[PDB]
């Protein structure tokens, strides 16, 4: 048996060296990762190692902010292994007694916060909390009573409304009839504001795991004067049950592993459109439908296709779209991507009549900035990246732009916008030649002259 004990002497340190940095670096953000990484070593023997690490975690002065994370981890570990919570309810309680005997209230604050949050998780019984509040009030250390009450008073009022309303009649008698110091006074009055309007608002900001994520195991302890904190907690203990402990840990680990792992819509929208006299009415009806964000693009597609069924363009569709766009940004982005969808994929399926309607429609929305002119960045006037459908579309779009804005305003809006794909000021010369050809041949050559200066330089 000597060889087995020697092996255990090494296994204990293996567990210690693996679980110590996990606890020492615990945070509310990485808690789940720490919880799963704890179970990759046999924790059923390392119960005492974890408990000693938790006690050291609460004693650390800087870890006051991270106590809720530690409490949630203790709750998870207690649900998987009740003995951890069993021994913590005693060791943290005795540690608080000790640190209160030495009057180091900074660490007492951490222990009381941890115990209160454990109370919120039903890891510890109410008895522990009422003993702690008896011990603090027989000394009149209100600064800790107030801190404990902010966190757990609302549960203590459900569980022990008798003693809870005694502690309130004591606390209020102090506030109303005793010569308090200001920093104490304003913290007591803020505890009264909390009870007055939202008694749970003292445990809002902590990390709160839902009750589904753990199983309730409640442990209790009664503090006697003879009892002393185990200063040798976490030291090696002979493990006569090593094999069965490993087998049980196998079952627990595999438990953790297994536990961790439209024609009618088109019709509806179409009928909304066809039942409306004005674009404002149609827009109102569609907005009142509260269409989900993922369906908005399909709605815009239905509006476009409906407008493409008409014999001509109609201001009705432009007003409708405009009202949708200005209502919310999700509609503006749905229209943006529908425009690039049309030019990139759908134009090949459109006949020249449909392209005429579509060009005028998008030109109208661009001419009023409902669709930003930056959307034209997807246009690439070249013999390879464009097709007759796209060029016919561009022709009608720009014709609408010039009809609504005039040459001067269109020229100024294009100049203030980077459109290298239509007015290449740099790059291959034949892209400049082809662009000036397109724009002059559609009659927009006045826009081209500025560009031609480069075309002339290219000849020399």
């Amino acid at each position: 048996q000597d060889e087995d004990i020697k092996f255990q002497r090494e296994n204990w340190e293996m567990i210690r060296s693996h679980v110590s940095p996990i606890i020492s670096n615990l945070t509310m953000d990485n808690l789940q990762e720490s919880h799963r990484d704890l179970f990759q070593v046999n924790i059923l023997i390392g119960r005492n190692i974890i408990c000693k690490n938790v006690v050291d975690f609460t004693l650390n002065k800087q870890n006051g902010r991270l106590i809720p994370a530690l409490s949630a981890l203790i709750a998870l570990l207690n649900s998987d292994i009740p003995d951890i919570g069993e021994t913590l309810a005693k060791e943290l309680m005795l540690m608080f007694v000790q640190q209160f005997n030495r009057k180091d209230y900074v660490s007492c604050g951490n222990i009381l916060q941890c115990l209160s949050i454990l109370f919120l998780y039903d890891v510890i019984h109410e008895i522990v909390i009422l003993q702690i509040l008896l011990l603090l009030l027989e000394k009149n250390s209100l600064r800790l009573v107030i801190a404990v009450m902010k966190i757990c008073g609302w549960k203590l009022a459900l569980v022990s409304k008798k003693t809870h309303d005694m502690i309130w009649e004591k606390l209020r008698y102090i506030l109303q009839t005793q010569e308090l110091s200001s920093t104490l006074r304003e913290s007591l009055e803020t505890l009264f504001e909390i009870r007055q309007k939202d008694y749970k608002s003292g445990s809002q900001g902590l990390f709160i795991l839902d009750p589904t994520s753990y199983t309730v195991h409640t442990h209790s302890y009664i503090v006697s004067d003879e009892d002393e904190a185990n200063k040798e907690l976490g030291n090696f203990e002979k493990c006569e049950n090593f094999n069965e402990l490993t087998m049980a840990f196998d079952t627990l680990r595999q438990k953790l592993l297994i536990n961790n792992t439209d024609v009618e819509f088109k019709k509806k929208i179409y009928l909304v459109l066809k039942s409306s006299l004005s674009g404002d009415e149609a827009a109102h009806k569609l907005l009142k439908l509260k269409i989900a964000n993922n369906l908005k693009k399909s709605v815009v597609d239905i509006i476009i296709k409906s407008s493409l069924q008409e014999s001509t363009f109609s201001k009705f569709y432009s007003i409708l779209s405009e009202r949708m766009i200005t209502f919310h940004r999700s509609w503006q982005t749905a229209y943006n991507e529908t425009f690039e969808q049309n030019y990139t994929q759908d134009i090949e399926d459109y006949e020249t009549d449909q392209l005429r309607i579509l060009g005028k429609f998008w030109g109208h929305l661009i001419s009023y900035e409902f669709l930003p002119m930056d959307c034209l960045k997807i246009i690439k006037l070249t013999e390879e990246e464009s097709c007759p459908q796209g060029r016919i579309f561009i022709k009608f779009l720009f014709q609408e732009l010039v009809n609504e804005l005039g040459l001067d305003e269109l020229q100024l809006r294009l100049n203030s916008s980077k459109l290298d794909g239509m007015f290449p000021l740099e790059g291959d010369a034949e892209h400049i030649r082809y662009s000036i050809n397109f724009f002059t041949a559609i009659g927009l050559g006045l826009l081209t002259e500025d560009m031609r200066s480069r075309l002339t330089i290219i000849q020399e």
């Binding site: 024609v263 088109k266 019709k267 179409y270 239905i302 296709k305 409906s306 069924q309």
Partner: peptide, 14 residues
């Protein structure tokens, strides 16, 4: 014979 307004199919079907 069935009238045209019955025979014709709304765009959203096709």
């Amino acid at each position: 014979h069935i009238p045209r307004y019955i025979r014709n199919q709304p765009w959203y079907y096709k």
